[PDB]
Symmetry: C3
Subunit: 333 residues, 3 copies
């Protein structure tokens, strides 16, 4: 049966971008092949130079977004080069059995494996590393991403009518727990292993020290802001593998939102803010109507503005005064 299926290899792209794909499937089911290489690396997360030992899928935090269609077979080759120091694996929330694939994919430095699973349910899901006994440590070290299983007929609105996006972006949100000395200064370690005993004590406080998009404070800003034009329909996929978040587009809305990200359910309309539970991927669809800067934020504003969970959208086009206008510009009484 599988022997007879057509096969296509896909080369992944770095978040927030997403590899090429078709919204509506033009072919029948296939075996979609992906290759990921694990990379343990030092990463600076804030302006002051705080450094950590990140554990990554393909070298980025979050890992890249995989996109397939319902009933395709996902075939993943997972390599753990000998330059890494730790055993890793992968658990796909989109998969059925063997702990999401975690029990079948344990690779020490120097090994590789190939897992295949059928994508039976449509929606966006989280995938994350989950080695027995050190699960929260690898996940909160940035070792998680997401996979999108699109219905073979693409997205649909509250009424069964089609929704087609022009642009798609992947925002992976990450809670980091950096050990601190007695004064509150962050600690630095030589190897991931040296940080371990202190990492566990830091996590039990349950209070992240940083919460960031795309692996660092200010990663999606300035020359890195997300882009769009008035009139474009944009799909933003957002994932949180460990902790709850509440995304909000400042100056915009979520016209159609799947908060818990499962496409067999109808979307919720006109959301100002929506809750994505820890361990879940969500998707919101919005059509830009006004140009300018928009702040995309986790709406606990302390987590957004003090801890790092804020990104930007830079949108081009003409201003519409019917929708909003300054009748009287700020001036002295």
């Amino acid at each position: 049966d599988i022997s007879t299926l057509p096969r296509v290899k896909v080369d992944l792209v770095k978040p927030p971008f997403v590899h090429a794909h078709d919204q509506v499937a033009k072919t029948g089911p296939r075996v979609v092949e992906f290759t990921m290489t694990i990379e343990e690396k030092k990463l600076v997360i804030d302006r002051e130079g705080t450094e950590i030992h990140a554990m990554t899928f393909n070298g980025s935090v979050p890992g890249p977004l995989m996109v397939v269609h319902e009933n395709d077979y996902v075939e993943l080759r997972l390599i753990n080069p000998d330059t890494n120091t730790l055993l890793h694996n992968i658990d796909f929330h989109a998969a059925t059995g063997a702990l999401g694939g975690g029990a079948l994919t344990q690779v020490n430095p120097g090994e590789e494996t190939t897992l295949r699973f059928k994508a039976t349910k449509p929606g966006v899901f989280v995938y994350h590393c989950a080695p027995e006994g050190m699960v929260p440590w690898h996940v909160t070290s940035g070792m998680n991403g997401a996979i999108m299983v699109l219905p073979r007929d693409g997205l649909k609105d509250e009424k069964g009518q089609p929704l087609t996006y022009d642009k798609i972006y992947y925002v992976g949100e990450q809670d980091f727990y950096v050990p601190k000395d007695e004064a509150g200064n962050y600690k630095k370690y030589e190897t991931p292993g040296e940080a371990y005993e202190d990492a566990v004590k830091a996590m039990r406080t349950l209070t992240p020290t940083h919460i960031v998009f795309n692996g660092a404070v200010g990663a999606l800003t300035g020359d890195h802001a997300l882009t769009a034009a008035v009139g474009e329909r944009v799909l933003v996929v957002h994932s949180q593998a460990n902790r709850d978040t509440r995304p909000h587009l400042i100056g915009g809305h979520g016209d159609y939102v799947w908060a818990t990200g499962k496409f067999r359910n109808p979307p919720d309309l006109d959301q100002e803010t929506w809750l994505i539970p820890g361990g879940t991927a969500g998707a919101a669809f919005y059509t830009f109507r006004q140009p300018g800067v928009y702040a995309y934020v986790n709406h606990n504003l302390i987590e957004a503005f003090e801890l790092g969970a804020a990104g930007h959208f830079k949108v081009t086009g003409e201003w519409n005064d019917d929708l909003m206008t300054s009748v009287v510009k700020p001036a002295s009484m």
Copy 2:
């Protein structure tokens, strides 16, 4: 086009009460005019006399509830008198563009401005002050409220049949982060500005010191309990601009609830408790069937009973023994 629209000025009321309005619109679209005056003021939040420098819209925490209909134009005159010390602005989640209006409404002490925006989506939304760089500080200092954009045909149930409330109350829930000395005693400051550096350190712990309804512990109790009669249909609007909450009416239910508060979506029925994400306004509809006291609470009971998130409803009428009765009153075995 707007030139030709009828205009009505509306005078706001202090929470938990709501200004007069029509559920079903009897007129066509209009320009609804409101005036708000910012007031920086000291406010005592608990029984022991803990005092803070509140930043308010119209002098209350939360700011007053504005009520309009879908497709009306909201025209707001925002004044920042010279007696205030800080720059403030306003971001409406109900609005499209310019950071919810935040980028068009920056007023230093002594200035005023007038913003107009079209209310294109029906539902209850949060509005809050959001000055660049000091956003969480103004929001958690009590500078937020909500606006309700009613469908021109009023509210509807899960089946498209009408829902008409007899009473409406606005409960604004607020998380406060009061600085403490080494022993845990709360600090006091001369001006809002003196508190700033300590305010930021207190917020980063992410642990509120107080969580209250209507600006103080016990604000909606005793002689201030909300009132109703068995048989009245009551709509309770609840908002949390920064942090998640889970309202629950002890001894009652949410017969129809819009947790994320957007009226184009059907309500959820028979809720015991519902989640309102930080940065959102929700509405629950309930018809009283039994008289007596009811406690309205944030269902994390530590936040409710130790931190201040508890209010009361005092309901009049006859007891119904079919629904509940004490078969055997407490007595010795």
Copy 3:
């Protein structure tokens, strides 16, 4: 009217098991009689021997699951033996009036009472002890459970077609706040009353020290894992009386989920993880398709793997390679 109703006494069972009942009602409305005995007891919660003074309904944490049908009358006899030290009561979220029954059921050691209430709304609800002024203390000491009010025609899917479970399990999740000395070692007390003043300070930090299923770390594991076979439809009821949780079946899904647990609403399909707000009971329905171990967890992984919120499912049957298969077993590059 009630005089004329048939009556059936039901003997409760210890979680995670559930007393015998019919999904579809074969009789008309009845008065269902239950008896619960309160038991204050020492309980060891973790591997290192941490001990607390648990306050329980029937001697277990959580209290047992009661199962009735919509419009039945629940008649509860609640006994507080003279061996207990504290006053207790009971508030049913499924009930209408008198604070969920809390105001009618206050019993000091040595007393008993019998309350009757009509179960007018279908769904799973939380019940918990709630004495005036010491509410969070009794709830977080393990004094809560849940009651399931089934539609007289049983469960239904998104389309009105029937859903019948073969097995049902009740998982009660509990947040504990154990006082600690200056080094972080947990404290021990002689009586519940001795712990009180320290219990209140521990709760205000809002950071649980333990979060467990069925009253202890590892309670649902090993020889205590939940069991099923490939092909069985399993309903898992989960409750959290004080704090939010996000259940997730590792290697599985929630095929149909009522997150806020109210059966008049349609279920959400294909969930990877769902949010149950503090103060609520939820239910997820899943049909096993692969054999092996599954981890059932609260998806904040630090709460799951460091704090105790993890249980197991041991499932029998044949592996299906169409759904998942290891193409290349881990081996050296």
